[PDB]
Write a protein that binds this ligand. Structure first.
Ligand SMILES: O=C(Cc1ccc(-c2cccs2)cc1)Nc1cc(C2CC2)n[nH]1
Length: 278
């Protein structure tokens, strides 16, 4: 750590404090996260390189403290969505961001690496129009938000799949479009019942095996499903169809990142420049 000069505190992650810092040897500006199976799994993430994944530059284990050195980006999507609240993020920019994030997920999922905790706070943007996934793989190795958590996790599936990240990304896509969180639960049951009130209480018809899940209760109220036309206006039919597939209850039915990239919604995808004031 004597090789890094702290500039300022930029966040409070799940595991510890995040600083903006300067590398004295290279002149590099980085993000520094202060945190044996953990060392080995984190060392594997150093190799998981993609343009839509925030680069893990180094892992430093000293005085039984763990420091992760990451590429620095100047803003996150939560701040950008707050800044764009009055006007809304333009649809071509939403589409570009969703397309890039799906590329990032398709890459990590092809290497059997899950994120598990996608949220606007860990989606980072730059002036060029890029968006990148941060904290990839750290879940495997302040109240933690439940808003983007997949229903199978809430229902007690301990051996969940890459589909959990598609669910979280569908929640974020809906929030960019409507300028409001899709399912802002403030407890596990509030989170689950918000999902059920919008998508309908799941049953064996739409999700075979759901009633045998560890935290499933036959006493759950039975709510009818709502039309996406009511849930995400003014999203067009291509976007609503894609979102529905990203929010299928059965993780096996839920669209993969690779199949989502082929969706007709991306026929006219472009890479616009965002409006950023730093
Ligand atoms: O999290 C951000 C965005 C951000 C940037 C600056 C600031 C502040 C500036 C002044 C006060 S707070 C607050 C947030 N970036 C970032 C994080 C990471 C790695 C995952 C750690 N890499 N890059």
């Amino acid at each position: 750590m004597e090789n890094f000069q702290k500039v300022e505190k930029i966040g409070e992650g799940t595991y510890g404090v995040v600083y903006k810092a300067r590398n004295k040897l290279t002149g590099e500006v980085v993000a520094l996260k202060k945190i044996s199976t953990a060392i080995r799994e984190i060392s594997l993430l150093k190799e998981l390189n993609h343009p839509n994944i925030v680069k893990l530059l180094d892992v430093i284990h000293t005085e039984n403290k763990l420091y992760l050195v990451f590429e620095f980006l100047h803003q996150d999507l939560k701040k950008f969505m707050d800044a764009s609240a009055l006007t809304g993020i333009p649809l071509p920019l939403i589409k570009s961001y969703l397309f890039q994030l799906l590329q990032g997920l398709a890459f990590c999922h092809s290497h059997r690496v899950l994120h598990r905790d996608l949220k606007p706070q860990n989606l980072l943007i730059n002036t060029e129009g890029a968006i990148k996934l941060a904290d990839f793989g750290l879940a495997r190795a302040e109240v933690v938000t439940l808003w983007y958590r997949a229903p199978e996790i809430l229902l007690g599936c301990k051996y969940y799949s890459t589909a959990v990240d598609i669910w979280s990304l569908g929640c974020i896509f809906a929030e960019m479009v409507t300028r409001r969180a899709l399912f802002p639960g403030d407890s596990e049951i509030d989170q689950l019942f918000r999902i059920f009130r919008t998508l309908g209480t799941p049953d064996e018809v739409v999700w075979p095996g759901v009633t045998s899940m560890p935290d499933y209760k036959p006493s759950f109220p039975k709510w009818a499903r709502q039309d996406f036309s009511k849930v995400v206006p003014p999203l067009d039919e291509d976007g609503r169809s894609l979102l529905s597939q990203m929010l299928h209850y059965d993780p096996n039915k839920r669209i993969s990142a690779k199949a989502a990239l082929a969706h007709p919604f991306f026929q006219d995808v472009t890479k616009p420049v965002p409006h950023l004031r730093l």
